[PDB]
Design an enzyme around this catalytic site. Structure first.
Site, PDB file in Angstrom:
ATOM      1  CG  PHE C 122      29.087 -25.946 -42.673  1.00  0.00           C
ATOM      2  CD1 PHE C 122      28.952 -27.312 -42.889  1.00  0.00           C
ATOM      3  CD2 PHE C 122      29.863 -25.203 -43.561  1.00  0.00           C
ATOM      4  CE1 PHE C 122      29.577 -27.931 -43.971  1.00  0.00           C
ATOM      5  CE2 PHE C 122      30.491 -25.811 -44.646  1.00  0.00           C
ATOM      6  CZ  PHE C 122      30.349 -27.179 -44.851  1.00  0.00           C
ATOM      7  CD  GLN C 243      26.685 -36.712 -44.969  1.00  0.00           C
ATOM      8  OE1 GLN C 243      27.784 -36.371 -45.406  1.00  0.00           O
ATOM      9  NE2 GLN C 243      26.263 -36.377 -43.758  1.00  0.00           N
ATOM     10  CG  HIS C 245      27.514 -32.772 -50.097  1.00  0.00           C
ATOM     11  ND1 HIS C 245      28.243 -32.452 -48.972  1.00  0.00           N
ATOM     12  CD2 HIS C 245      27.296 -31.605 -50.747  1.00  0.00           C
ATOM     13  CE1 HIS C 245      28.457 -31.149 -48.943  1.00  0.00           C
ATOM     14  NE2 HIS C 245      27.892 -30.611 -50.009  1.00  0.00           N
ATOM     15  CG  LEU C 255      31.545 -31.471 -52.333  1.00  0.00           C
ATOM     16  CD1 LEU C 255      30.596 -32.549 -51.844  1.00  0.00           C
ATOM     17  CD2 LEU C 255      32.463 -31.022 -51.212  1.00  0.00           C
ATOM     18  CD  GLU C 258      25.719 -28.462 -45.610  1.00  0.00           C
ATOM     19  OE1 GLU C 258      26.401 -28.768 -44.609  1.00  0.00           O
ATOM     20  OE2 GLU C 258      24.619 -28.993 -45.868  1.00  0.00           O
ATOM     21  NE  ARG C 289      27.452 -33.203 -45.561  1.00  0.00           N
ATOM     22  CZ  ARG C 289      28.210 -32.110 -45.575  1.00  0.00           C
ATOM     23  NH1 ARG C 289      27.669 -30.917 -45.780  1.00  0.00           N
ATOM     24  NH2 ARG C 289      29.518 -32.209 -45.385  1.00  0.00           N
ATOM     25  CG  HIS C 356      29.754 -36.154 -48.964  1.00  0.00           C
ATOM     26  ND1 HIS C 356      30.502 -35.276 -49.718  1.00  0.00           N
ATOM     27  CD2 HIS C 356      30.064 -35.897 -47.671  1.00  0.00           C
ATOM     28  CE1 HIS C 356      31.235 -34.525 -48.916  1.00  0.00           C
ATOM     29  NE2 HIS C 356      30.989 -34.883 -47.669  1.00  0.00           N
ATOM     30  NE  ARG C 400      31.014 -35.349 -42.305  1.00  0.00           N
ATOM     31  CZ  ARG C 400      30.925 -34.716 -43.473  1.00  0.00           C
ATOM     32  NH1 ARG C 400      30.093 -35.146 -44.414  1.00  0.00           N
ATOM     33  NH2 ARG C 400      31.678 -33.649 -43.704  1.00  0.00           N
TER      34      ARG C 400
HETATM   35  C1  LIG Z   1      34.649 -37.265 -50.559  1.00  0.00           C
HETATM   36  C2  LIG Z   1      34.719 -35.963 -49.818  1.00  0.00           C
HETATM   37  C3  LIG Z   1      34.778 -35.991 -48.428  1.00  0.00           C
HETATM   38  C4  LIG Z   1      34.832 -34.804 -47.696  1.00  0.00           C
HETATM   39  C5  LIG Z   1      34.831 -33.581 -48.367  1.00  0.00           C
HETATM   40  C6  LIG Z   1      34.775 -33.551 -49.758  1.00  0.00           C
HETATM   41  C7  LIG Z   1      34.716 -34.737 -50.489  1.00  0.00           C
HETATM   42  C8  LIG Z   1      34.656 -34.671 -51.988  1.00  0.00           C
HETATM   43  N1  LIG Z   1      34.882 -32.402 -47.651  1.00  0.00           N
HETATM   44  C9  LIG Z   1      34.942 -32.421 -46.268  1.00  0.00           C
HETATM   45  C10 LIG Z   1      34.999 -31.230 -45.545  1.00  0.00           C
HETATM   46  O1  LIG Z   1      34.998 -30.151 -46.132  1.00  0.00           O
HETATM   47  N2  LIG Z   1      35.057 -31.252 -44.165  1.00  0.00           N
HETATM   48  C11 LIG Z   1      35.058 -32.461 -43.495  1.00  0.00           C
HETATM   49  O2  LIG Z   1      35.111 -32.485 -42.265  1.00  0.00           O
HETATM   50  N3  LIG Z   1      35.006 -33.643 -44.207  1.00  0.00           N
HETATM   51  C12 LIG Z   1      34.944 -33.639 -45.592  1.00  0.00           C
HETATM   52  N4  LIG Z   1      34.885 -34.830 -46.310  1.00  0.00           N
HETATM   53  C13 LIG Z   1      34.907 -36.154 -45.594  1.00  0.00           C
HETATM   54  C14 LIG Z   1      36.365 -36.421 -45.192  1.00  0.00           C
HETATM   55  O3  LIG Z   1      37.240 -35.766 -46.090  1.00  0.00           O
HETATM   56  C15 LIG Z   1      36.758 -37.896 -45.125  1.00  0.00           C
HETATM   57  O4  LIG Z   1      35.762 -38.636 -44.456  1.00  0.00           O
HETATM   58  C16 LIG Z   1      38.085 -38.048 -44.381  1.00  0.00           C
HETATM   59  O5  LIG Z   1      39.038 -37.137 -44.884  1.00  0.00           O
HETATM   60  C17 LIG Z   1      38.649 -39.459 -44.491  1.00  0.00           C
HETATM   61  O6  LIG Z   1      39.969 -39.464 -43.995  1.00  0.00           O
HETATM   62  P1  LIG Z   1      40.797 -40.835 -43.851  1.00  0.00           P
HETATM   63  O7  LIG Z   1      42.269 -40.528 -43.747  1.00  0.00           O
HETATM   64  O8  LIG Z   1      40.320 -41.629 -42.658  1.00  0.00           O
HETATM   65  O9  LIG Z   1      40.513 -41.625 -45.225  1.00  0.00           O
HETATM   66  P2  LIG Z   1      41.170 -41.173 -46.625  1.00  0.00           P
HETATM   67  O10 LIG Z   1      41.261 -39.669 -46.699  1.00  0.00           O
HETATM   68  O11 LIG Z   1      40.372 -41.722 -47.786  1.00  0.00           O
HETATM   69  O12 LIG Z   1      42.645 -41.811 -46.582  1.00  0.00           O
HETATM   70  C18 LIG Z   1      42.808 -43.197 -46.775  1.00  0.00           C
HETATM   71  C19 LIG Z   1      44.258 -43.593 -46.530  1.00  0.00           C
HETATM   72  O13 LIG Z   1      44.333 -44.983 -46.277  1.00  0.00           O
HETATM   73  C20 LIG Z   1      45.332 -45.594 -47.068  1.00  0.00           C
HETATM   74  N5  LIG Z   1      44.868 -46.886 -47.608  1.00  0.00           N
HETATM   75  C21 LIG Z   1      43.637 -47.174 -48.138  1.00  0.00           C
HETATM   76  N6  LIG Z   1      43.626 -48.472 -48.517  1.00  0.00           N
HETATM   77  C22 LIG Z   1      44.832 -49.015 -48.239  1.00  0.00           C
HETATM   78  C23 LIG Z   1      45.357 -50.293 -48.422  1.00  0.00           C
HETATM   79  N7  LIG Z   1      44.799 -51.102 -49.318  1.00  0.00           N
HETATM   80  N8  LIG Z   1      46.655 -50.546 -48.025  1.00  0.00           N
HETATM   81  C24 LIG Z   1      47.430 -49.555 -47.455  1.00  0.00           C
HETATM   82  N9  LIG Z   1      46.900 -48.292 -47.283  1.00  0.00           N
HETATM   83  C25 LIG Z   1      45.625 -48.028 -47.666  1.00  0.00           C
HETATM   84  C26 LIG Z   1      45.657 -44.637 -48.203  1.00  0.00           C
HETATM   85  O14 LIG Z   1      47.045 -44.601 -48.436  1.00  0.00           O
HETATM   86  C27 LIG Z   1      45.122 -43.293 -47.744  1.00  0.00           C
HETATM   87  O15 LIG Z   1      46.177 -42.448 -47.349  1.00  0.00           O
END
Ligand SMILES: *Cc1cc2c(cc1C)nc1c(=O)[nH]c(=O)nc-1n2C[C@H](O)[C@H](O)[C@H](O)COP(=O)(O)OP(=O)(O)OC[C@H]1O[C@@H](n2cnc3c(N)ncnc32)[C@H](O)[C@@H]1O
Ligand code: HEM
Ligand SMILES: CC(C)Oc1cccc(NC(=O)c2ccccc2I)c1
Ligand code: SF4
Ligand code: F3S
Ligand code: FES
EC number: 1.3.5.1
Lengths: 239, 138, 613, 102
Positions: C122, C243, C245, C255, C258, C289, C356, C400
């Protein structure tokens, strides 16, 4: 200029006497994206913001935009709008489901059924877990292929009439497929008691091989193949 | 909260509200593998009703079978008309026969993919016509 | 007031976030023996962590013999020495332990001949502290790793008595005298306001990718928790670091992972030249990245772009075996056929550097504790925690490293749980909230509900997204950033000139996206103002005005007879940004980076060096 | 846990291949013994056939039990009628043959 007609299901719960009615919108396809969700976002952003719908990834892997497009339960960001201007696209919520507001179906029962099958790895000896990785061969991993990719969008379950007429008791393809997804997993030891959980007529045997589930899957998965494979395991298993 | 308690609170909310059911039979597109499933029941129920009528009449109604055959001859036996009369009995029977085998093949797990559903579906639909016409002319 | 029904909930801990980090923190507390509530606006599966395709990093030693200390060096070199080494130590040591745990939970990892978890090359990872070539430690579930991660994490989370507030839009943090008392939230289902109070609160709302026009992130990635921390008068760390990507579909912006550049993928420009081998000597298109995407966007400036517009690049997956593409990259095989309309085995895929990941967010310890900044010193905010993309423990620093966020999720999600577990017991007095508290959150909801402004909600969102895309791209000039700062400043004043048509309670997506717009702006202001303030080229943030690496010393020559620079003269420090909620003025302080490890004897401190692959 | 629902499913498939195996057997070998075996398979398969219909559509605790009791009586009268038709009358193998050349 290329205007496209959209017929969308509309119902407002915050208004007294409001019945389910269809609403028409006209959108230029040159200003819009290729997919159905792009148009749903466009009328939301430009024409009518009163439209309410589920969206998130617009990639086809989260399974939010699960709806009925032209008589088929597929993802709106996966399926593209028919360029033919003569045909009017009819957008409906997932069939035989309690509508909360505009194309947003109540999936509370769907998620609860997924909980009842216990979709987690169960070992007999859990005292030695969390310290070493379990061994699984390349062939044993190939058995999980075409099963784990399930998004739980609820397109297959909401397509069959057996989940329409028997929604409460019958689990449905999506839920049953995942029960099978944990059955063939060589790491799981609870295979026998997982099958013993389906030993009632309604939970599993309410399927009649109608084959509407696998025909509407956005990911191209075959729940029916898995459902029929459960019936074979149910017929022949030890004790 | 447990697994079944969410199911209980699902029905206790929706039935006590004014939420509508999203259309199901009104909007969904008609497909051949799905339409053949309805006809399997359509033939099944009607064909079982034929046997039920045959058994109940033989038990309740007086007179032997040979005397009942002479009662049919009162219509003067129309050559083309009596062909259609026997055709309307073998058609629901032979459709349910060939499609019944297809269901038994599905129980073994063979040919459950979408292309193979339409392929085996037409095979059954054609075999229905041939076995219905073939056995009517005997 | 009389219109909105307030419902108080009593818990031991509240975790805002149902994805990876938040999810692991939620049931992790429930496993410890806590009555844990999980507030989330989406269903746990609908979370973004699903969109993860590449993999998860762990030095298990399944391909070649590996050391977690070599993974420590790659993460710290990738962070361009803005990364907190105390956190990098904690993450890389817990790296193999957490993945082995995930496999035992039910995550169906891809397998090898041995039967162990399949690792593969990677972005910018090496053996022997950067002396032994390319490292293979990226554990994957065949192009659908994050989807398989979230499902098997959620599947395991049903085992414990966790109260999930599914489809609840959290508005603000319940705060009383500098202490977090819980969360105030809006139930989307009926339009009622709920005050879920607890002794501790964990934040995992994810990044704010929707601040820009073209991004790989979901529509629900609006950085709400970052704005909740922002509105509470608490600082946000390193918000200018965004970042890009390298690989992503030119059209919709989805996406292409990578994972391609690792299985054997190559990058090609207009001429057909392998351009990445010109910018990177013995690294190629397998570099960092920021370095890969930096070259890609620079190739467009020359006029060597591809397509009818000549503004994008190409990804070569043509020469790769079709037997490998179907097994190792099935996720991109389908999605590139759908959106781009391009065959993955017989045609090269169009790619463009797009937004990203957000390195910054909420300042965090190595334990998961949220940090404020009083009198130039670190101070722990009681009852408040952060983990994942939304948090800034700066384990990623300035840039990152590839496939480290899902590791950042599980390790620091576990750390947030253990911090509440080992300190403070369950059943302890739930701190009393004010009988009035949350008034401003209710009044903010009521203002946006009956909005009769001159600008439509989406028409204001479009102005934000296009402004950030042009004024704060991969390359950013101080002359462009100055105009970009005052442009976003005026758009914050327009947040009272907005129009909302839908005036209902049950499922008001017109309201919550406007609330998301308010939360996006608070992230957008601190990103642009922090970018124009920083005068260096470190990691993702690269200035045309100042292309130098401004450290304490000039590390090109060895430090021994050289003199040290003052703290407020070098840029090797964390950007802590505040913003006055009413006026919209961004005032920003700075704190030193953590260089010391958890144990010097077990893991050596890595000094700053010439950042180049 | 006792497996009763799985055995009922296989029982439906056992009579399915039995009834499929009897149709050419009744044509090739029409006898008194074939009359009863065809009647025993024809009524049992139908009883479990409509049994599947009642479980699908008939809603309620009181209605389903009333329909299952009604179907049991309908099936019992059907099997008793055919056996009476085989013993005292012509018999389905020879009876359908008389109707065939008509
Ligand atoms: C964008 C992206 C990121 C990504 C990736 C591919 C894409 C298109 N591929 C990855 C990969 O292959 N390997 C890796 O290690 N990371 C990869 N990423 C980055 C990564 O996926 C993210 O940084 C990470 O998954 C973020 O996780 P997190 O749980 O912290 O954030 P989330 O997935 O966006 O979930 C948000 C949750 O919060 C709740 N929420 C949001 N706002 C509110 C409010 N207003 N009130 C109550 N709850 C809220 C949501 O419900 C959600 O579940
Ligand atoms: C020899 C030819 C026949 C075959 C191969 C056959 C096979 C089958 C099978 C396997 C089913 C269950 C379909 C499923 O999987 O859901 C079925 C349905 C049914 N059959 Fe038959 N059968 C035959 C003849 C008959 C006859 C002559 C009758 C009339 C007495 C009959 C009555 C029924 C009924 C009432 C059903 C309803 C079950 C349903 O459709 O859900 N069958 N048939
Ligand atoms: C969209 C329409 C055509 O869809 C419908 C409507 C009504 C009944 C059915 N058909 C069944 O319900 C059915 C048929 C055979 C076996 C088991 C069943 I549960 C399908
Ligand atoms: S099996 Fe397919 S259609 Fe059914 S829920 Fe899963 S992804 Fe959706
Ligand atoms: S009831 Fe079912 S699982 Fe498939 S076979 Fe029909 S949709
Ligand atoms: S929105 Fe993610 S699948 Fe349609």
């Amino acid at each position: 200029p290329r205007i496209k007609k959209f017929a969308i299901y509309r119902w407002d719960p915050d208004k007294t006497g409001d019945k389910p009615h269809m609403q028409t919108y006209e959108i230029d396809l040159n200003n819009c994206g290729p997919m159905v969700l792009d148009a749903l976002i466009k009328i939301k952003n430009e024409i009518d913001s009163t439209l309410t719908f589920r969206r998130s990834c617009r990639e086809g892997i989260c399974g939010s935009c699960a709806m009925n497009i032209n008589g088929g339960n597929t993802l709106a960001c996966t399926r593209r709008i028919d360029t033919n201007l003569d045909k009017v696209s009819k957008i409906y919520p997932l069939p035989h489901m309690y509508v909360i507001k505009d194309l947003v179906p109540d999936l509370s029962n769907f998620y609860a059924q997924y909980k009842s099958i216990e979709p987690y790895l169960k070992k007999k000896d859990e005292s030695q877990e969390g310290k070493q990785q379990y061994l699984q061969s390349i062939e044993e991993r190939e058995k999980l292929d075409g099963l784990y990719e399930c998004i739980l969008c609820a397109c297959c379950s909401t397509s069959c009439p057996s989940y329409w007429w028997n929604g409460d008791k019958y689990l449905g393809p999506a839920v049953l497929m995942q029960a099978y997804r944990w059955m063939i997993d060589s790491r799981d030891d609870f295979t026998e008691e997982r099958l013993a959980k389906l030993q009632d007529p309604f939970s599993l045997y309410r399927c009649h091989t109608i084959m509407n589930c696998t025909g509407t899957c956005p990911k191209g998965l075959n729940p029916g193949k898995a459902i029929a494979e459960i019936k074979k395991m149910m017929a022949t298993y030890k004790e | 909260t447990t697994a079944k308690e969410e199911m209980e609170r699902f029905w206790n909310k929706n039935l006590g509200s004014n939420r509508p059911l999203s259309p199901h039979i009104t909007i969904y597109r008609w497909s051949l593998p799905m339409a053949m499933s309805i006809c399997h029941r359509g033939t099944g129920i009607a064909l079982s009703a034929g046997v039920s009528l045959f058994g109940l009449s033989a038990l309740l109604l007086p007179g032997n079978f040979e005397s009942h055959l002479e009662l049919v001859k009162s219509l003067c036996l129309g050559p083309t008309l009596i062909y259609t009369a026997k055709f309307g009995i073998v058609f629901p029977l032979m459709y349910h026969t060939w499609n019944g085998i297809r269901h038994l093949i599905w129980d073994l797990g063979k040919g459950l993919t979408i292309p193979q559903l339409t392929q085996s579906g037409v095979v059954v639909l054609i075999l229905t016509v041939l076995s219905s016409v073939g056995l009517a002319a005997m | 007031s009389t219109q909105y029904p307030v419902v108080d909930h009593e818990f031991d801990a509240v975790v805002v976030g149902a994805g990876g980090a938040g999810l692991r923190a939620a049931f992790g507390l429930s496993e410890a023996g806590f009555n844990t509530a999980c507030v989330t606006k989406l269903f746990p599966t609908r979370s973004h962590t699903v969109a993860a395709q590449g993999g998860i990093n762990a030095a298990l030693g399944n391909m070649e013999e590996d050391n977690w200390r070599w993974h420590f060096y790659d993460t710290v070199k990738g962070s361009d020495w803005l990364g907190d080494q105390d956190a990098i130590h904690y993450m890389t040591e817990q790296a193999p332990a957490s993945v082995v745990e995930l496999e035992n939970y039910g995550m169906p990892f891809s397998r090898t001949e041995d039967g162990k978890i399949y690792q593969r090359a990677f972005g910018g990872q090496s053996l022997k502290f950067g002396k032994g070539g390319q490292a293979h430690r990226c554990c994957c579930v065949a192009d659908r790793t994050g989807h398989s991660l979230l499902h098997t994490l959620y599947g395991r989370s049903l085992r414990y008595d966790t109260s999930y507030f599914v489809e609840y839009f959290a508005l603000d943090l319940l705060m009383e005298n500098g202490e977090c008392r819980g969360v105030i939230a809006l139930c989307i289902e009926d339009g009622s306001i709920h005050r879920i109070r607890a002794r501790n609160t964990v934040v995992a709302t994810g990044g704010y990718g929707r601040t820009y026009f073209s991004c790989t992130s979901a529509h629900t990635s609006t950085g709400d928790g970052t704005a909740m921390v922002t509105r509470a008068g608490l600082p946000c760390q390193d918000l200018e670091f965004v970042q890009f990507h390298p690989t992503g579909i030119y059209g919709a912006g989805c996406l292409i992972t990578e994972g391609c550049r690792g299985e054997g993928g190559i990058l090609i420009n207009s001429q057909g030249e392998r351009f990445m081998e010109r910018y990177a000597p013995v690294a190629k298109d397998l570099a960092s990245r920021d370095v890969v995407s930096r070259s890609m966007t620079l190739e467009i400036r020359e006029g060597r772009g591809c397509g009818p517009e000549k503004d994008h690049v190409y990804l070569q997956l043509h020469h790769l075996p079709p037997e490998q593409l179907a097994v190792r990259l099935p996720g991109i095989s389908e999605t590139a056929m759908i959106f781009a309309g391009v065959d993955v085995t017989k045609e090269p895929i169009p790619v463009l550097p797009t937004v990203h990941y957000n390195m910054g967010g909420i300042p965090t310890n190595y334990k998961g504790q949220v940090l404020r900044h009083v009198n130039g010193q670190d101070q722990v905010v009681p009852g408040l925690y952060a983990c994942g993309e939304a948090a800034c423990a700066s384990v990623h620093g300035a840039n990152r490293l590839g496939a480290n966020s899902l590791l950042d999720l599980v390790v620091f999600g576990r750390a947030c749980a253990l911090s509440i577990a080992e300190s403070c017991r369950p059943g302890d007095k739930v701190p009393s909230i004010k009988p009035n508290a949350g008034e401003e959150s209710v009044m903010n909801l009521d203002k946006l509900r009956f909005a009769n402004g001159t600008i439509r909600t989406s028409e204001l969102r479009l102005s934000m997204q296009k402004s950030m895309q042009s004024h704060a791209a991969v390359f950013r000039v101080g002359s462009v950033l100055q105009e970009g700062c005052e442009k976003i400043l005026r758009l914050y004043g327009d947040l009272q000139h907005l129009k909302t048509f839908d005036r209902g309670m049950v499922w008001n997506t017109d309201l919550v996206e406007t609330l998301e717009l308010q939360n996006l702006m608070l992230c957008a202001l601190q990103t642009i103002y922090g970018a124009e303030a920083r005068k260096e080229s470190r990691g993702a943030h690269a200035r045309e005005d100042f292309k130098e690496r401004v450290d304490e010393y000039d590390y090109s020559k060895p430090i021994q007879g050289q003199q040290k620079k003052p703290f407020q003269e070098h840029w090797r420090k964390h950007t802590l940004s505040y913003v006055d909620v009413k006026t919209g003025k961004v005032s920003l302080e700075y704190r030193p980076v953590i260089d010391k490890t958890l144990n010097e004897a077990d893991c050596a401190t890595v000094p700053p060096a010439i950042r180049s692959y | 846990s006792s497996k009763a629902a799985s055995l009922h499913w296989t029982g439906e498939r056992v009579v399915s291949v039995l009834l499929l195996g009897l149709l050419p057997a009744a044509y090739l070998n029409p006898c008194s013994a074939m009359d009863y075996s065809l009647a025993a398979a024809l009524t049992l398969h139908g009883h479990w056939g409509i049994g599947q219909v009642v479980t699908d559509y008939v809603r309620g605790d009181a209605l389903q039990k009333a329909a299952k009791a009604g179907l049991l009586a309908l099936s019992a009268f059907t099997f008793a009628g055919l056996c009476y038709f085989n013993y005292h009358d012509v018999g389905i193998c020879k009876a359908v043959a008389m109707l065939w050349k008509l």
